[PDB]
Design a protein around this ligand. Structure first.
Ligand code: FES
Ligand SMILES: [Zn+2]
Lengths: 54, 119, 295, 194, 168, 52, 86, 77
């Protein structure tokens, strides 16, 4: 679902524009592929420690 | 001013005098000062309750949706004000801190009860 | 089928506009405010007639009667109930969409209570919050104390009824509960003390005639018009009364007798008017005096 | 010690013969002049004419007469400090009153206008809104969401869900020696202190 | 008094009386007028009164004037596309010239209102800040909200001094 | 509006970049670890306590 | 200053003289009274049927002190000072 | 705050910030709440991103914007 207020404002545009419907506004979260935090990143865009030995 | 790296963020800019805090929601550069230069002001938040007993939070939804579609991040306090309004979902830690307070207050009812019962 | 004319109909506005009248001396009364030295123009007879014609066009824009609306319905709509947030806060939050290009009656104002309920702000909360972020000259966040019964009576005693209506128009909305009570109180006092002239040549006369016609309290107003040689307006008031109440004793009698002009007042006085006898006596005097002038 | 008899009803002093014999038809400040150097005076008057029950050499119009009470009911005295052509309260240097009495007059002049005792220009403003319809969802009813009708949270993750034993076992192994007592499902509603 | 003849021209009130706001196309405006002759009188008065009014509203438009180069006066505009607009202003008054260029190359009253309305959205009333930009600086100026401590001292319970002292 | 050139600021920039590419530390120096004090001798920085 | 004040205050034209001299109505316009035209004087003689020719620009000598004040350029720490009633 | 060339304090030489204790349940439950919250906020963000493209594309190449450029160019001729 949309969060409560956003949903209330999407149903007021419909009725203002004249659209009459009983369908729910819903977010397509099928595109969003949530990867784990422990997923291998790119080491070819990562930096290296500078040469200042102590 | 030009900053190395950085991004835009919708945060709170503290204002007001001592013991009278007033925040004003602004969209500003990440590296800029808290109360420094801002791109736009998107609202205000008054923490202190008023005579009627309510906290006022002004939100320019139209402009908040614009800067979020341009690459603006959100601060945790501002993500918790949008969850209470219904624009965003309740922040996970708002749900977890409410559960911790329940367990805590349920732990205090036992001690209080025992005292009145045993003594 | 058959709908009763409303307050904004062309036929009703023309009748209430004529009853109000136009007085430039009273419409453009010298205001007590900061002053500047006046400017003078050398005008001819014809230049002065056009200047007075432009003032009549500006007085009709200043007498534009505000629409009469009915008491708005309370807002009791819950958007969400979140029981996990109960007890996490002590006071309630009020979120307002301060987007500029939005009418204030289409603006979303929600209230997150300490019980986790996300509801819509009430009318009193909406109007108040809209004065904090969209301040309007003349309006105050906290309701003034002049609208109390004791203070209003003081004002009525000084024949300042038009000032009470101007303050109410700048503080409350047409469909409020305080705007409709403050107006009715003023109208009721005017009928009691016969102060109809005060609202004449103003934008609050039509609304006062609309309240009496619907509540059948035009006996006093009709007398005042008769006592000021205003029969034309007195006859249209009965005609309007008839239109709004077609199934009435006076309306049916008229059709039967095809009463016109002064005749309508006589038919109305007997059948429906509470003060029928007084109207005839007042109307009688006028007719007798008119005959002498005609001679 | 001066104990004015018009303390409770101050408006009776201006309609007396003791006031008419001293001021007449002019205002109380008509015959008052400030003492200063030059032709240009200071832009502010003295803070107060009475210090610890002691009056100064040249008291102001309100402090020199103890029977003049600055109250919101004494409309006849407050009309002398407001212009009859512009409805503006004079500044202190105009009348010569002290900052303390000029601040008390303004409050009484603003409080007499809030009670309908003092007449002031009230403009005829225009309406706030161009439309008056109350059909928008903001001021009307919104179709209740399914979750609100079933007595369920907007999102499922709001509610506590007990995790499986195998997953807790991973965490324990992951955080050996740095653990806390496992937390059980929270109470349905917030407890209160009896 | 003010030096020069017709000193009212050197006033901001008179420079803002112009009703000729050119479009974005107009880049250069050239006025060719003749010092003498009855026919050219309007052009001389257009250069004496209205040119200041046109340049004040259009400061980025170049206005160049040439004397007695041709037998008759004329106006010529140079647009950004490469089009040239010739306007023979002979046997015409300055008011006619001012009304003629406002119809072929000037903006109307509809396009000008919108420009002003777009500048009203830059100054939101809800916003708080300095008087220069915003109406109010803080929300303590709003009746009902907690007043500023400078004017009204807060309660001892709302100050961190006593909170620290009370706690420890 | 003719900026006075800063030649030493460009020479140093090139020299520093060059030295960073010829004296660059290897993985053996950067990522060495003493297993008793659990520090990186190259930088003397302790590792986090969850990695020990 | 005394001989010049009485001289200028005696040579001032009233609204009735102006009307008689020009045979026209002298109309007073006030912001407080809005657009209402107030006739303060009318000619006793024959009212002229032709209006005064409108002038696009008037060739009247102005005062820099007054123009400098209306445009917010006359800065002085001695003007508009709070003084006593006169 | 300090710079890179400022030396560290001698009181922090031997400082070890020990990690916090972990509650397996709360930690696991909170790791899923964040997973969903960020998935719901990514979808909302994408919606808002598509509205900034449209408006930008509905003013330079819109149907109501190309219908006014021709009216302004037709009135010029
Ligand atoms: S200015 Fe708002 S608190 Fe001091
Ligand atoms: Zn005093």
């Amino acid at each position: 679902p949309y969060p409560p207020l956003l949903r209330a404002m999407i149903i007021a545009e419909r009725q203002k524009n004249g659209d009459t419907s009983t369908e729910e506004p819903m977010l397509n979260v099928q595109r969003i592929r949530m990867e784990p935090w422990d997923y291998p990143a790119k080491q070819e865009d990562k930096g290296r420690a500078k040469g200042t030995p102590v | 001013k030009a900053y190395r790296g950085g991004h835009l963020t919708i945060r709170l800019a503290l204002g007001g005098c001592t013991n009278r805090p007033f925040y004003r929601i602004v969209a500003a550069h990440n590296k800029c000062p808290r109360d420094g230069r801002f791109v736009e002001q998107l609202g205000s938040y008054d923490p202190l309750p008023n005579s009627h007993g309510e906290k006022l939070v002004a939100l320019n939804l139209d402009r908040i949706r614009h800067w979020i579609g341009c690459g603006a991040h959100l601060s945790k306090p501002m993500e918790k004000l949008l969850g209470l309004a219904g624009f965003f979902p309740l922040h996970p830690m708002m749900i977890t801190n409410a559960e911790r307070l329940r367990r805590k207050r349920a732990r205090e009812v036992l001690l209080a009860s025992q005292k009145t019962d045993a003594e | 089928e058959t709908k009763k004319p409303t307050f904004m109909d062309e036929e009703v506005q023309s009748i209430l506009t004529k009853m109000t009248g136009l007085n430039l001396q009273k419409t453009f009364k010298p205001a007590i405010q900061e002053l500047k030295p006046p400017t003078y123009k050398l005008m001819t007879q014809a230049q002065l007639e056009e200047a007075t014609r432009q003032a009549v066009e500006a007085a009709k824009v200043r007498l534009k009667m505000p629409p009469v609306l009915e008491e708005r319905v309370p807002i009791n709509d819950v958007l969400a109930e979140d029981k996990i947030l109960e007890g996490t806060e002590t006071t309630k939050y009020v979120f307002t969409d301060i987007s500029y290009s939005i009418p204030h009656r289409e603006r979303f104002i929600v209230v997150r209570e300490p019980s986790g309920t996300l509801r819509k702000a009430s009318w009193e909360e909406r109007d108040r919050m809209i004065q904090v972020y969209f301040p309007k000259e003349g309006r105050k966040i906290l309701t003034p104390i002049i609208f109390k019964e004791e203070n209003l009576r003081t004002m009525y005693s000084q024949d300042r009824h038009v000032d009470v209506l101007n303050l109410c128009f700048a503080q409350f909305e047409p469909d409020s509960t305080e705007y409709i009570k403050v107006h009715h109180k003023t109208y009721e006092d005017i009928d009691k003390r016969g102060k109809y002239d005060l609202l004449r040549s103003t934008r609050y006369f039509g609304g006062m005639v609309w309240y009496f016609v619907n509540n059948k309290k035009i006996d006093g107003l009709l007398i005042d018009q008769i006592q000021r040689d205003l029969i034309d307006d007195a006859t249209n008031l009965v005609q309007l009364y008839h239109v709004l109440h077609p199934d009435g004793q006076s309306a049916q009698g008229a059709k039967d007798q095809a009463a016109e002009g002064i005749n309508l007042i006589k038919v109305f006085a007997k059948t429906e008017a509470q003060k029928g006898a007084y109207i005839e006596l007042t109307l009688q005097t006028y007719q007798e005096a008119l005959s002498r002038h005609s001679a | 010690v001066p104990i004015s008899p018009y303390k409770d009803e101050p408006w009776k002093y201006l309609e007396s013969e003791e006031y008419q014999e001293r001021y007449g038809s002019r205002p109380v400040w008509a015959d008052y002049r400030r003492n200063h150097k030059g032709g240009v005076p200071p832009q502010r008057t003295r803070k107060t004419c009475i210090r610890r029950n002691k009056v100064v050499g040249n008291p102001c119009p309100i402090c020199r007469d103890h029977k003049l009470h600055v109250d919101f009911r004494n409309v006849k005295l407050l009309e002398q400090f407001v212009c009859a052509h512009t409805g503006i309260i004079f500044y202190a240097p105009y009348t010569g009153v002290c900052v303390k009495q000029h601040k008390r007059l303004t409050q009484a002049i603003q409080k007499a206008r809030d009670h309908g005792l003092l007449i002031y220009h009230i403009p005829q403003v225009e309406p706030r809104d161009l439309d008056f319809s109350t059909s928008h969802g903001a001021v009307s009813a919104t179709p209740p969401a399914p979750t609100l009708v079933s007595g369920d949270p907007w999102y499922p993750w709001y509610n506590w869900k007990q995790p499986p034993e195998r997953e807790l076992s991973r965490l324990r192994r992951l955080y050996q020696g740095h653990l806390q007592e496992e937390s059980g499902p929270p109470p349905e509603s917030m407890p209160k202190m009896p | 008094p003010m030096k020069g003849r017709f000193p009212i021209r050197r006033t901001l009130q008179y420079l803002s009386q112009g009703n000729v706001v050119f479009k974005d196309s107009v880049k250069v405006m050239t006025v060719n007028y003749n010092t003498h002759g009855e026919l050219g009188e309007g052009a001389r008065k257009f250069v004496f009164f209205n040119i200041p009014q046109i340049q004040y509203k259009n400061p980025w438009v170049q206005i160049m004037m040439f004397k007695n180069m041709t037998p008759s006066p004329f106006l010529r505009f140079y647009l950004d596309s490469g089009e040239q607009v010739l306007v023979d202003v002979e046997t015409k008054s300055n008011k006619e010239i001012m009304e003629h260029i406002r119809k072929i190359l000037g903006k109307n009253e509809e396009t000008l209102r919108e420009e002003e309305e777009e500048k009203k959205q830059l100054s939101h009333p809800a916003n708080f800040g300095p008087r220069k930009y915003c109406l109010r600086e803080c929300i303590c100026e709003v009746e009902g909200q907690v007043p500023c401590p400078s004017l009204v001292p807060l309660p001892k319970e709302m100050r961190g001094k006593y909170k620290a002292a009370l706690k420890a | 509006k003719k900026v006075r050139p800063r030649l030493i600021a460009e020479l140093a920039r090139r020299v520093r970049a060059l030295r960073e590419q010829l004296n660059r530390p290897r993985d053996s120096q950067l990522y060495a670890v003493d297993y008793e004090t659990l520090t990186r001798p190259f930088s003397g920085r302790r590792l986090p306590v969850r990695a020990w | 200053l005394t001989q010049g004040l009485f001289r200028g205050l005696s040579r001032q034209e009233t609204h009735q003289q102006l009307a008689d001299k020009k045979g026209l109505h002298v109309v007073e316009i006030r912001e407080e009274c809005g657009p209402l035209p107030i006739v303060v004087a009318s000619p006793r003689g024959p009212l002229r049927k032709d209006p005064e020719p409108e002038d696009e620009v008037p060739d009247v000598k102005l005062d820099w002190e007054d123009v400098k004040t209306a445009q917010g350029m006359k800065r002085s720490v001695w003007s508009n000072l709070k003084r006593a009633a006169t | 705050r300090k710079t890179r060339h400022d030396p560290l304090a001698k009181s922090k030489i031997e400082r070890v910030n020990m990690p916090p204790a972990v509650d397996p349940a709360e930690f696991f439950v909170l790791m899923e709440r964040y997973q969903h919250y960020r998935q719901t906020v990514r979808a909302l963000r994408m919606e808002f991103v598509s509205e900034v493209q449209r408006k930008v594309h509905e003013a330079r190449a819109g149907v109501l914007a190309e219908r006014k450029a021709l009216k302004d160019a037709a009135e010029h001729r």
